[PDB]
Enzyme design. Structure first.
Site, short mmCIF file in Angstrom:
data_model
loop_
_atom_site.label_atom_id
_atom_site.label_comp_id
_atom_site.label_asym_id
_atom_site.label_seq_id
_atom_site.Cartn_x
_atom_site.Cartn_y
_atom_site.Cartn_z
N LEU A 56 128.49 19.04 118.74
CA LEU A 56 128.85 19.62 120.21
C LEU A 56 127.18 19.45 120.64
CD1 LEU A 56 131.09 22.47 119.74
CD2 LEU A 56 131.76 20.28 119.98
N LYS A 66 122.56 27.97 110.61
CA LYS A 66 122.89 29.47 110.51
C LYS A 66 124.55 29.33 110.47
CE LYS A 66 118.87 31.37 112.78
NZ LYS A 66 118.01 30.32 112.97
N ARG A 177 135.21 32.69 144.08
CA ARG A 177 135.84 31.71 143.15
C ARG A 177 137.04 32.01 142.75
NH1 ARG A 177 131.66 31.51 140.30
NH2 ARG A 177 132.60 31.30 138.15
NA NA Z 1 124.53 18.94 118.75
#
Ligand code: NA
Ligand code: NA
Length: 329
Positions: A56, A66, A177
């Site tokens: 990601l 971690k 919004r």
């Molecule tokens: Na990454």
DNA sequence: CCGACATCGCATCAGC
DNA sequence: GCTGATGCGC
DNA sequence: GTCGG
């Protein structure tokens, strides 16, 4: 997606984010952790390894590491050690008070001031803003339900129009919004007489704040200039019924020729602004919070393009208009 | 390896 | 007194 | 801390 999925990981990253922000005074690491926690909160899969998360965007070697320790043990040593830490926990806590940032909190904890009670006893060591944040410590942590925001809005629009029928006020933010709840109310204001190369008639904004104080809607002032007001406000209580908590409200006086550029920016969302910045440029335009300008062949931005509405901005970049409801990104 | 990372108005501190 | 730097919330 | 020139 359900928080149960990776809530343990997102909370871990958010906690780490607040410590960097309030104790280490590392804003960038703060945003780094939030970006990571955010992209992790969106991932529709229960993360099984840091390497998976590492894929990601916003998750690097350290966080993936971690994440692994957390999955294997149920917690994080560096985090457990920070929680049990006297000063670091006091310093983190103190920043929850509006007015107290990392520095003031660092200073209070130094001289022994560690709790809301310690501050309440050292009132003269707190500036005007901080006393108000203290006074409404609890209120400022509550959210504002949409219906409450509407009631709040009705009052702003009514009083502004009462001061001058040409004022244009728009409550932006997540509210515009269509959000269900808010943390504050951001009102953008403009008047035909106020333009980039005109007078600021240092009362256009004053007369409005002053009007809202008269009907007793605005109850406190945190800061007030010729173009930006920041204070507190409160809805009239419905006779002998738990009075509404005090709320944060900001008011911006922007020039009429930059007004819609202002409404666009403060309505967001933050993602939506990035897609437009990104898009706008490829089309040959530069879009900031104030204006939209054409970019010559040499990269040289030209004069600000005229804008009379939000749509005008969308039309300049070959993009169809989008209601503030579909601007979540 | 090493800089960018979002933005800026206003209150107030530091210094001349 | 003034101007610039810093801190703050956004 | 992460990304990326
Ligand atoms: Na990454
Ligand atoms: Na604070």
């Amino acid at each position: 997606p359900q928080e149960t999925l990776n809530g343990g990981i997102t909370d871990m990253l958010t906690e780490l984010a607040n410590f960097e922000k309030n104790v280490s005074q590392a804003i960038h690491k703060y945003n780094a952790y939030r970006k990571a926690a955010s992209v992790i909160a969106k991932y529709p899969h229960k993360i099984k390894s840091g390497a998976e998360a590492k894929k990601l965007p916003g998750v690097g070697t350290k966080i993936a590491e971690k994440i692994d320790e957390f999955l294997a043990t149920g917690k994080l040593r560096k985090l457990e050690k920070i929680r049990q830490d006297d000063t670091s926990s006091s310093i983190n806590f103190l920043t929850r008070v509006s007015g107290i940032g990392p520095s003031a909190a660092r200073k209070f904890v130094d001289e022994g001031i560690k709790t809301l009670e310690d501050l309440r006893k050292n009132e003269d060591k707190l500036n005007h803003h901080q006393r108000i944040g203290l006074k409404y410590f609890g209120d400022f942590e509550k959210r504002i339900p949409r219906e409450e925001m509407l009631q709040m809005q009705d009052i702003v629009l009514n009083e502004v129009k009462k001061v001058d029928s040409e004022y244009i006020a728009t409550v932006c933010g997540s509210f515009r919004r269509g959000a269900e709840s808010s943390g504050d109310m951001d009102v953008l204001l403009t008047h035909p007489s106020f333009t980039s190369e005109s007078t600021k008639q240092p009362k256009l904004l004053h007369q409005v704040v002053e009007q809202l104080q008269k009907v007793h809607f605005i109850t406190d002032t945190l800061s007030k200039g010729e173009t930006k007001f920041m204070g507190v406000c409160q809805l009239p209580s419905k006779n002998d019924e738990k009075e509404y908590p005090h709320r944060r409200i900001d008011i911006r006086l922007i020039p009429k020729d930059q007004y819609y550029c202002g409404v666009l920016y403060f309505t967001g969302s933050d993602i939506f602004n990035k897609n437009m910045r990104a898009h706008a440029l490829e089309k040959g335009f530069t879009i900031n919070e104030y204006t939209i300008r054409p970019l010559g062949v040499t990269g040289v931005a030209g004069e600000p393009l005229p804008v009379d509405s939000e749509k005008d901005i969308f039309d300049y970049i070959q993009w169809k208009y989008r209601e503030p409801k579909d601007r979540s990104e």
